[PDB]
Amino acid sequence: SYTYQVSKHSAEMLHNLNGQRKDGGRFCDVILRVGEESFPAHKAVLAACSEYFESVFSCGKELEMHTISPKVFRDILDFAYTSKIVVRLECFPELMTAAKFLLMRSVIEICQEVIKQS
Amino acid sequence: SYTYQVSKHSAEMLHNLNGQRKDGGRFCDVILRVGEESFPAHKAVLAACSEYFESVFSCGKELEMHTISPKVFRDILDFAYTSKIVVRLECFPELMTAAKFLLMRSVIEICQEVIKQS
Numbered sequence: 153s154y155t156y157q158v159s160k161h162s163a164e165m166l167h168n169l170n171g172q173r174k175d176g177g178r179f180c181d182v183i184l185r186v187g188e189e190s191f192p193a194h195k196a197v198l199a200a201c202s203e204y205f206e207s208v209f210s211c212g213k214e215l216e217m218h219t220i221s222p223k224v225f226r227d228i229l230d231f232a233y234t235s236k237i238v239v240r241l242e243c244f245p246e247l248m249t250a251a252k253f254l255l256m257r258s259v260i261e262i263c264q265e266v267i268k269q270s
Numbered sequence: 271s272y273t274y275q276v277s278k279h280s281a282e283m284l285h286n287l288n289g290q291r292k293d294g295g296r297f298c299d300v301i302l303r304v305g306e307e308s309f310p311a312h313k314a315v316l317a318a319c320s321e322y323f324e325s326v327f328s329c330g331k332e333l334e335m336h337t338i339s340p341k342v343f344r345d346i347l348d349f350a351y352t353s354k355i356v357v358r359l360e361c362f363p364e365l366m367t368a369a370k371f372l373l374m375r376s377v378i379e380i381c382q383e384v385i386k387q388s
Contacts, residue, residue, distance in 0.1 A: 154357040154387070156380050161319075161353035162280040168318035179314035179327065181299065194314050196297035200286035201279075209297065235279035239272040262274050269272070 163235070169197055170233035182209075185216040186225045193229060201232045203255035220250045231259060239266055281353070287315055288351035300327075303334040304343045311347060319350045321373035338368045349377060357384055 172178035177192025184191040199206035208215070217225060224246045231237040237259060239247060244266060251259035290296035295310025302309040317324035326333070335343060342364045349355040355377060357365060362384060369377035 153359045154384055156355045156357065158349075158353050158355070158376050158380075161349075161376060162284045165315065165318050165350075166280045166283055169314060172314060172317065179317055194312070196287060196290060196312050196314065197283065199290065199297055200283050231276075231279075232283075235276050237274045237276070239274065241271045258276050258279060262276075266272055 166233060166235070169194065173229075173233060181213070183214040184225070184229075185214050186220060186222045189222045190214075191225065191229055197232060201256055201258070204253065219253065221246060224250050228254065228256065228259065232256075237262055239263070241266075241270075284351060284353070287312065291347075291351060299331070301332040302343070302347075303332050304338060304340045307340045308332075309343065309347055315350060319374055319376070322371065337371065339364060342368050346372065346374065346377065350374075355380055357381070359384075359388075 173180060173192055173194070177183070180192035180194055182193055182195045182198070184193055195205070195209045199209055220228075221243070224243055227238055227240075227247065228250060239262065244263070247259070248263040248267075251263055291298060291310055291312070295301070298310035298312055300311055300313045300316070302311055313323070313327045317327055338346075339361070342361055345356055345358075345365065346368060357380065362381070365377070366381040366385075369381055
């Protein structure tokens with residue numbers, strides 16, 4: 153009888169999921185081991201933005217990531233949880249390669265735009 | 271050096287989380303037992319939109335919900351996962367009471383608007 157859309161809901165949901173991650177890994181069910189460092193995350197969130205993690209977790213508390221540097225993987229995770237990517241030309245080849253490997257379409261598209269400007 | 275915002279990312283993240291739920295509870299870690307019915311969900315998503323579920327899961331595969339009808343709880347879950355609430359006057363008192371009990375601020379605010387129109 154009355155139907156309502158809440159514009160800010162999706163961004164607020166992702167903000168609070170990012171807050172859970174940043175506050176000591178609340179409700180996080182996987183620890184990404186990337187070099188020496190560890191990144192708590194939500195398998196469900198990772199699967200929502202990466203066809204790689206979707207396939208992996210579909211097909212187990214930690215996952216050791218061998219081919220991505222912690223600096224680059226931090227930026228990729230922050231993107232997944234915030235919608236913002238900071239592209240640093242100093243490690244741009246590695247970001248693009250990691251976005252390809254993880255099948256993160258949004259980040260791939262962004263890297264393809266940076267090349268067109270470079 | 272180049273910083274990017276992806277407008278549609280948060281809505282796409284929530285869309286894919288809703289898809290995981292609807293497709294047999296993929297990556298879901300709690301089953302909400304509400305009467306006879308069962309609702310797979312993500313504890314992390316539930317905590318992101320409900321101070322009740324945040325407190326509960328913070329303070330265990332299923333959770334039996336005793337005081338909310340399955341019709342109403344279906345609408346509340348669909349809101350959490352889609353940003354859309356369909357307010358049915360036939361069960362509006364129960365929706366408001368459930369939104370209060372679950373401390374879902376967005377839905378409370380919406381119910382307060384329906385009363386002002388009623």
